[PDB]
């Protein structure tokens, strides 16, 4: 059996000799809570609804339907609207429904009751019950009638149902709609890196944990953590995402002043050799040493932690997100050349990084790192060992990006800034053991 | 601590490969700050560094343990733009080959964003940091000013026959030979500059073959570098094995067959 | 068996491009002529002058190229279609300029295969009808009148101009020789006549069985106005009308709905299924095309199966053009696009040289077609030898390197030669796929370069996903396609994968790779494009001697 | 508040004066269990896997990959494979994981543990964990290796991941993939009517219940049962699907021998008038009486019950599914003409039935009733008041259909025929109160 | 057929975000003169012609004669500084009932491109081609017109 020591975001020991199973998405109550939280929590842009109604800009993208303005001021009536929304979606007094006014009335944080998720098959009940409750609250508050309520409905729901999503609407989730899933089990993989950086409040160690947890939850739902592959994925989660044995934190500190991608490679190999994860296999006539993995899953986990530390060191030094794509590529390319062992996810991190580099420096698509996610066609190919680094790079950026977290995910920060599992993920996971 | 070995192989090409990776590259020429800035084309020599965001000290930073323990580069502290240097290298025994330019950047410099392509190799970084990295590469034995040059666009040439005077084809002729020296009188994206940057002399063909990192039939034949072939095979084989099942027992799974190596 | 000759197969094209040139010279004089050296660029410039004058707005102008240079500071060289005498300018192989290329894709996109057994069972069960050769014959007449867009039941219908839809037709095919011989031959794909080599006809008839199928080809003009999602629907509509007439049904009763569900779904064999939201596309578009299906559409296998290399490289030509030029270079991007990323695989006999060299190496080391060990050791041996040899060719012949001037082109051709050699030798597509990635890795360390910025996303994911059995990683190559996750983005792989999928079944001397229905459907010589000799067709399109379907000259002014 | 009497499938009273909220999808434990059951339960066609491998017909649709046959006999090793699958997917000893051999080894019933659903965002973990566990189990049992296991994997998973679904595969669900959802909250609406008839074992009263429950669970997840619309939907569920007050059973029985669509119309109106749901409003000069609804949501519920009873009387008499499309149309068209009150779902059942009639009698698409579902573009438009009737019609058919439940859903019958919620849904819902 | 092809081959693309990127990341100044150079570049490249690389093969200009890009804006001052062959003249086309002033007020001082890719391309392919084709040649044109690296972040 495998055990790990759990350390927090400041390199402090939280819990010793924890069974690896205890941090599994299938067993850790804090992880299960995080999943439930991102599924059932949505934000409402009451300012955006008000703007769309006052300006007849239903659907966004410069749309204007002349003459169909509806003059309502929900931001001025936010507490009353919030109370009606809660009454409409709460199932039982004392359940976990929460509706909170934020930003002085510009936004509402809505934690839909878990029972509404349980009674469904997917996760969209938070988005749909909130949009419906809001539409009714506005209709009632402003005495809307037969022919203007449909326009206000579009202010809330966007162009739904002409589109499958609430495009241009004002109910927001960190998840997307299920039809955007690239494959089976990808809903928890479809979380924009800018969102992850805001969930973590740009605390990079917490960003690694939040993103790694959700990525591996997705991998479990894809059915790619079964049998031996469970140990493979859990060790990667623990060492890359949960700062197992303090290795991500210590390696980053060890390389933070003068280090580089290459010095993190060297430290990773040295730790694997000193810890008995790898040994010298054969020596070539030149003196080059071919290594062997004594514990293949654990060699991957060490490479995964080194990939993350290398991202923190290189992107941390640049204070720029864009170097994450080359960091993931060259960390793993060079560690293979250094050892003749395969790198993280046996080339799938390096391969993801090749295409991610291309699609973050070319005309053909992609964008800056903050627009990628585990469901993105470019960055989906590793089973959870690439995106957490991307989210960390986004969090470390000091302002080089056009589509930054504060420009695409400002409401995400406010909505989750007081949610304990996002404020201190590592502490809540360890406490749930 | 761990002592890196970098790369296999025993030929002098492999030795050169480890020089580039380890950063132990001899200096063969000098390029002035002003001349380099002029060729890179991001600002006028002597001009202040433009910024993309305020200096970190002026705006403060989120409470992040990684930020508090990873030192920003000088360019990042200052809030410089991210700019770039981009090089093309001839396949006719240029000192440098794209991937090993990127390994040189990733091992020996901080806060860099290298990218490897067949006909161009790019280093993006905060401007002042990118200049220092570019200076180190361009002044070193990783660079022949005939077999390599700065090309931020219109890069065609790495795979073409050299010109009669040994210059690698450049559609924009940003460089030309003047009295044995390579002169650059356009910046790296083809805009004429009001100076003549002297990049010294081209390597002799024999020097190039001694300094190059490429394997090819007129130098060190790749077929003969069995340590490198063994390394490639081992990594492919182990990747194949562990994708099937990530455990040592995969190494003898049905279908592996009698895998065998030259030197191990 | 094949014997690799003394002169490299690519030398003819080099000598035809560079008369008098010493092919070992590493240096050249540059004259920096610009576009005036090239007749096609000159013609394009004059076309752009007319365009701008007629519409009052600037369009094409060689002088807009940046840097104050026009195209052709070096020599602009033409391309020889491999195995063909035809040498063409590169622009003649751009898919927009090449109607053979456009029609190959239109011919695939407008095809659907639809079973008849379920429909006949419906007529028996629900209406108590008897299905005979005579009733099938009447149906086949009805469906060839109605499928192009003409009326059979209602009054005061307006119809498509038959001349605009002259490429649209329906043929039946069956493994039951007795039924096939009872229907007028104009309506039947004759499996025995088309598949007369190496007993392929008997393999196809056994694999299809005594079932009856329709090969439906809707009009090119329709899929050009619309999309590939039109095909199965259009087919089903006119199938339904033809059953109503041929069996005297109510023109719209419950049983007709059963025929519709059969024709649209339950007995419908699409060429490609839909794609996910980021690259949303209807069915019958290239992203959904499996490599096994792509290889089965190409028909050189039924012509000359004793040379498995020829068919293999015709599949390469089919797939690289479709997937790189049309699909990735247009559907998924556009502009100037990706012509030469694909031409590297089907011009100047380069891939042919590298692959025939490998075939000869394998024949002498491992034995005859399809008998080499199906293992990683064997893929390693073949890929490494084929790749080293090809790299030495590029190194020894400077103008060969100059032809495949982008690393991505060299990577695809070296890996294709490696994987096609392995597929022919082992008879196994999955083993060949291991050789494909082996080539990439060998290549990268030789030259310290491989392809473009994002060329080896799939190749670094590659070796480990060959033998994965995890949900979104594991998949046999025949069923992989342009939506297999690692493959969903990048040039220089997809058509090559189709190629060495074909190579494995050619090496095993199979009649097809993946679906016998696809194989029979596309053998039919009544298609516009000749699927039995891809590169000869491309030559015709490049020379403006290919006549496509779908033009509108009958209904437009001069 | 509203109360209903609950009755079973034979018209016997189960419980009196039950609060309408107690049969809500958000509150009733039996309904919550039924949702959980269809989400996590899958069937494995071991015979189909064996056939696909032995004949190299991976992917179906006449595909044959010459030379790539894999000679394995999982139907002869079904108990051993079932035990391994159980071990691979079970999270905790004694949890609700079930793996059962059926058909003498031809099929496996796999109830994946609820925790794997909880740990994800959607419902696919049952499909994916089973496919993965089965692939591993076959690999180990038959000593498969590098280059043949990929083919066996396609025997299980079909053409996934070239396709988004497991097309041609051998892991089956009564649900579809999320990307097939027409809109937000549609996953529980995407249940083929042939499947629903088999879940109910062709007991038409139980089929009404199962189908109505799952339809209204979908509608709740779509957000279209909020506020006043909760009462609207719950009354339709209770009276159309749960035989509230025995109205569907009694109306069917009293019209079963000589009745017609039109006599069920008349009985519905008479019951509404006698019960005070409607009253005479005004009388026209001809003597025609315009009615008014005293309780609007209750009038809809009476029309929903009448629609169902009409389906049972007309399709029952025909012993044919196809008449359901016209029954739904003409029951509601004529009840409006009889009363000048709007019919069920205010025309949305009639409208669904117009297009459903068209697409079950024309060249353009659709098919027999058995292929439709609440997510089908043709039959999605009523919020749950049309499809239960379609499923009932499919159950009542005595053999007129080409694509019958036995041909498309035989494995569904075997998988669920011992599941209590599906064997006696009305008794289970009442017992949960 | 052409009415539908004209709809399908059309995409509208803002320029403000692109100009903001050039300012923020490269410190470029966007002027009427740089915009004019961009509009010439994009009307050469959009039909399928090359502006950066060497040995490129191109679409026959006569097969793609219907492909073009124009800009439009609520900012009359800018619309007036660009060669009118490249501009949709809102004031001339919408002279009746003050329609031009309603449109300009709804668009604001924002700049847009009306991109029409070649009919022949959407006939070979589908409507999904349109926004991708537009973006590729928009990108090529920005690279040329602002002396960017031909492929940087
Ligand atoms: C701007 C980019 C970045 C990007 O996102 N795409 C570009 C450009 C794009 C344009 C170039 C059209 C034009 O010139 O106006 C098009 C044609 C796509 C389009 N928009 O239609 C293209 N590349 Ni590119 N691109 C190619 C290639 C390449 C090779 C060329 C290297 C050399 O030595 O010449 C390199 C990548 C590498 O080094 O591996 C390359 C890079 C680049 N490629 C650099 C420009 C390089 C430069 O400044 O010169 N391409 C190739 O390697 C061969 C095929 C070729 C494509 C056209 C065709 O297939 O016929 C073209 C494919
Ligand atoms: C077989 C169907 C059932 C079905 O699924 N589609 C049909 C037939 C289909 C075919 C008839 C082509 C042919 O004659 O071969 C096409 C053209 C669609 C196609 N497959 O291309 C069509 N109908 Ni229909 N169909 C039409 C119509 C109609 C009207 C015609 C009634 C009359 O009095 O003539 C009636 C429906 C109704 O009664 O309302 C009708 C029914 C029917 N329509 C009955 C055949 C009726 C008959 O036996 O004559 N169509 C129309 O109402 C006008 C438009 C006309 C369509 C052609 C056009 O738009 O130009 C054509 C649209
Ligand atoms: C990545 C993705 O782009 P987005 O990030 O979604 O804009 C995708 N493009 C591509 O994959 C382009 C592939 C063709 C051009 C590059 C070939 S190497 C697409 O448009 O759907
Ligand atoms: C119903 C649905 O067909 P299926 O039941 O999915 O076969 C759908 N057809 C249509 O809606 C056809 C509409 C055009 C022909 C009838 C016009 S009234 C389609 O093909 O996707
Ligand atoms: O230069 S890139 O590799 O981004 C594009 C090659 S077409
Ligand atoms: Cl296992
Ligand atoms: Cl191990
Ligand atoms: Cl309400
Ligand atoms: Cl009321
Ligand atoms: K089209
Ligand atoms: Kr949110
Ligand atoms: Kr320089
Ligand atoms: Kr240089
Ligand atoms: Kr042309
Ligand atoms: Kr007519
Ligand atoms: Kr059919
Ligand atoms: Kr296709
Ligand atoms: Kr062979
Ligand atoms: Kr390399
Ligand atoms: Kr099932
Ligand atoms: Kr060219
Ligand atoms: Mg032979």
Residue numbers in the entry:
A (entry chain E), D (entry chain B): 2 to 434
B (entry chain F): 2 to 265
C (entry chain D): 2 to 559
E (entry chain A): 103 to 255
What's the publication's text?
Here, we obtained the true atomic resolution structure of their methane-capturing system (Methyl-Coenzyme M Reductase, MCR), circumventing the isolation barrier by exploiting microbial enrichments of freshwater nitrate-reducing ANME-2d grown in bioreactors, and marine ANME-2c in syntrophy with bacterial partners. Methane capture, the first reaction in AOM, has been proposed to be carried out by the Methyl-Coenzyme M Reductase (MCR). In the proposed mechanism, the heterodisulfide, made of Coenzyme M (HS-CoM) and Coenzyme B (CoB-SH), would react with methane to generate methyl-S-CoM and free CoB-SH through a radical mechanism catalysed by the Ni-containing tetrapyrrole cofactor F43019,20. Despite their physiological differences, these ANMEs have extremely conserved MCR structures, similar to homologs from methanogenic Methanosarcinales, rather than the phylogenetically distant MCR of ANME-1 isolated from Black Sea mats.
The discovery of a gas channel in the ethane-capturing enzyme prompted us to investigate whether ANME-2 MCR possesses a similar access system for methane. Still, we performed krypton labelling on ANME-2c MCR crystals to verify the existence of an accessory tunnel via experimental means. Based on the anomalous signal of the dataset collected at the krypton K-edge, no signals were observed in the active site or tracking in a hydrophobic tunnel. Krypton atoms are rather positioned on the outer shell of the protein, trapped in hydrophobic pockets, as previously observed for the methanogenic enzyme from M. marburgensis. The absence of a dedicated gas tunnel connecting the active site to the solvent reinforces the proposed scenario that ethane-specialised homologues evolved this strategy by introducing loop extensions and dedicated PTMs. Labelling with gaseous krypton did not reveal any internal channels that would facilitate alkane diffusion to the active site, as observed in the ethane-specialised enzyme. Still, our structural insights showed that methane-oxidising MCRs do not contain gas tunnels that connect the solvent with the buried active site, in contrast to the ethane-activating enzyme. Our structural analysis suggests that methane first enters the catalytic site before the heterodisulfide closes the catalytic chamber.
